[PDB]
């Protein structure tokens, strides 16, 4: 058994001035709503501000890649559609392995607009962050950005830019497995 996906949002990454590929996410709009609704709204840019032309500001190797802060580039901003912060909904799902998306927070009940794509099984973050997605396709592209040259502050030397980001409708919610990738 596993959770059911309901929506699919896709990204189009770019390191430097060279196309790399496309990452397609699978979001659980029934297990944890109001967190998918934030991610979907920012992806399509319904309310003006969105993830377009954003940047990944933490490329910590063998741990995770974190991005989504569009207010400023240093990684200490970000606002959601429900004001500024909104509380954690439920910790039903865990970081089962690589390619699982979750909401990065700076305390308790401080969900904003920053996420991170897990790359190794982080069992010590369970019960602290809320997981709302899974990387369905393009698992070889997320590993391209991770192996880029980075300085001491974990900021990549070459900028990573989300060129495009949209949304694909799903006609029939299909379950997935809690294994990896």
């Amino acid at each position: 058994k596993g959770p059911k996906v309901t929506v699919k949002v896709y990204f189009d990454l770019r390191i430097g001035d060279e196309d790399v590929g496309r990452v397609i996410f699978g979001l659980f709009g029934k297990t944890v709503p109001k967190t998918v609704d934030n991610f979907v709204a920012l992806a399509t840019g319904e309310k003006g501000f969105g993830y377009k032309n954003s940047k990944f500001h933490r490329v910590i190797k063998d741990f995770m890649i974190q991005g989504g802060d569009f207010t400023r580039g240093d990684g200490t901003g970000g606002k959601s559609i429900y004001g500024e912060r909104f509380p954690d909904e439920n910790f039903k799902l865990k970081h089962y392995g690589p390619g699982w998306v979750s909401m990065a927070n700076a305390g308790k009940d401080t969900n904003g607009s920053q996420f991170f794509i897990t790359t190794v099984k982080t069992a010590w973050l369970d019960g602290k962050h809320v997981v709302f997605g899974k990387v369905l396709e393009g698992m070889e592209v997320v590993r391209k950005v991770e192996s880029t040259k980075t300085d001491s502050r974990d900021k990549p030397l070459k900028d990573v830019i989300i060129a495009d980001c949209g949304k694909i409708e799903v006609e029939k919610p299909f379950a997935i497995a809690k294994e990896a990738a």
Partner: peptide, 12 residues
């Protein structure tokens, strides 16, 4: 019914 609409942050 849907339970997500009845909760909001302390600032709100």
């Amino acid at each position: 019914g849907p339970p997500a609409a009845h909760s909001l942050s302390e600032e709100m």
